[PDB]
């Protein structure tokens, strides 16, 4: 993957970045050759935090006046790391008249429960927690509608337990709503 800090502005003085869906579109429009290899039941083979990518980004309209690339092969389980992730802890329930509900004890401790489930065998670590976004499309046809997503910002220190598994987590993403700002997991050596 490769990491870059880009900035999006609004093209005129009337706001013709107002909504999340337009953020998705603006993000995808800055990558020409795109591919999507999907499998049923698991996740998909970019990710973003309110940017990691496979293809070379080139600046577009109303952006920076200038255009790093990393692979985790260089240089261990047991080590503590810096962390931040914005995700959406959820539960799937039956609704009268299915559905997605945020309460998965509801509160910090349920969120840590959400952590042991989401991390599983990967890395046991310090997820800063809070349990507590609305959006609607600008009108473009067949392009989603309006709704609400609840994001979270976890920060802390992790220990690694299975390098290749951590690689799977870092590149696939952890949790729903990756397309609305969530998913990107950042670790750093202490």
């Amino acid at each position: 993957t490769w990491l870059t800090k880009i900035v999006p502005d609004l093209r005129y003085r009337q706001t013709r970045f107002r909504t999340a869906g337009n953020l998705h579109r603006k993000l995808i429009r800055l990558s020409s050759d795109l591919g999507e290899e999907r499998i049923a039941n698991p996740r998909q083979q970019l990710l973003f935090r309110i940017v990691q990518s496979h293809s070379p980004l080139r600046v577009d309209r109303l952006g920076p006046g200038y255009h790093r690339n990393l692979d985790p092969f260089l240089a261990d389980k047991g080590s503590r790391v810096r962390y931040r992730i914005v995700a959406s802890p959820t539960k799937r329930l039956g609704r009268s008249e299915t559905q997605r509900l945020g309460l998965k004890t509801w509160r910090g401790a349920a969120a840590e429960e959400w952590w042991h489930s989401r991390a599983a065998a990967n890395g046991l670590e310090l997820l800063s927690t809070y349990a507590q976004d609305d959006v609607r499309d600008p009108g473009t046809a067949d392009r989603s509608r309006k709704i609400r997503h609840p994001a979270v910002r976890f920060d802390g220190e992790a220990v690694i337990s299975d390098v290749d598994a951590v690689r799977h987590a870092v590149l696939n993403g952890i949790g729903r709503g990756k397309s609305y700002g969530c998913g990107l997991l950042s670790l750093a050596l202490i």
Binding site: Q14, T15, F17, D133, A151
Partner: protein, 161 residues
């Protein structure tokens, strides 16, 4: 003019603060590099630039308990109604009315954020255009603020006959 973009900032931003916490926390840290996290929300609608960015950030740094009239009338009505100190808010008004464009934004946050504390109504659009009016007529806007305050205080006291 200016007031049109100001209203766009008040609705748009009024929704992002009460709606999304990460943006609310990223813009409130700038009430300079340290505020660049805020441009991503406010930069596209913008002396006026300093006005917009500051008022949006300060507007955003309020407690949740707080989430065409001017600021002087809002202060006088806050004194008469909420019972704030009158004589002391008086000297702070008299100190802001003398500041320059850079001084208003450094003396302003305590009174406005504290005024919104204890749920005082504040029309942010007029305040924005006012902070924009410091670039051309600082003394004029200052005089309007003070006059509005005393006149509305007097009328509110006389109408309590």
């Amino acid at each position: 003019y200016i007031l049109q973009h100001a209203d766009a900032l008040v609705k748009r931003v009024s929704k992002l603060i009460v709606n999304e916490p990460a943006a609310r926390a990223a813009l409130r840290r700038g009430v300079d590099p340290r505020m660049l996290a805020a441009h991503r929300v406010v930069a596209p609608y913008v002396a006026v630039e300093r006005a917009f960015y500051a008022v949006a950030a300060i507007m955003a740094a309020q407690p949740r308990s707080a989430r065409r009239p001017n600021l002087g009338v809002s202060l006088a009505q806050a004194v008469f109604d909420k019972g704030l100190n009158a004589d002391s808010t008086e000297q702070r008004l008299h100190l802001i009315a003398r500041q320059n464009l850079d001084g208003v934004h450094r003396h302003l946050p305590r009174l406005v954020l504290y005024l919104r504390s204890d749920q005082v109504h504040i029309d942010w659009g007029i305040l924005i255009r006012d902070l924009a009016r410091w670039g051309h007529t600082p003394r004029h806007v200052a005089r309007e603020w003070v006059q509005d305050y005393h006149r509305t205080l007097e009328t509110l006291t006389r109408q309590a006959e």
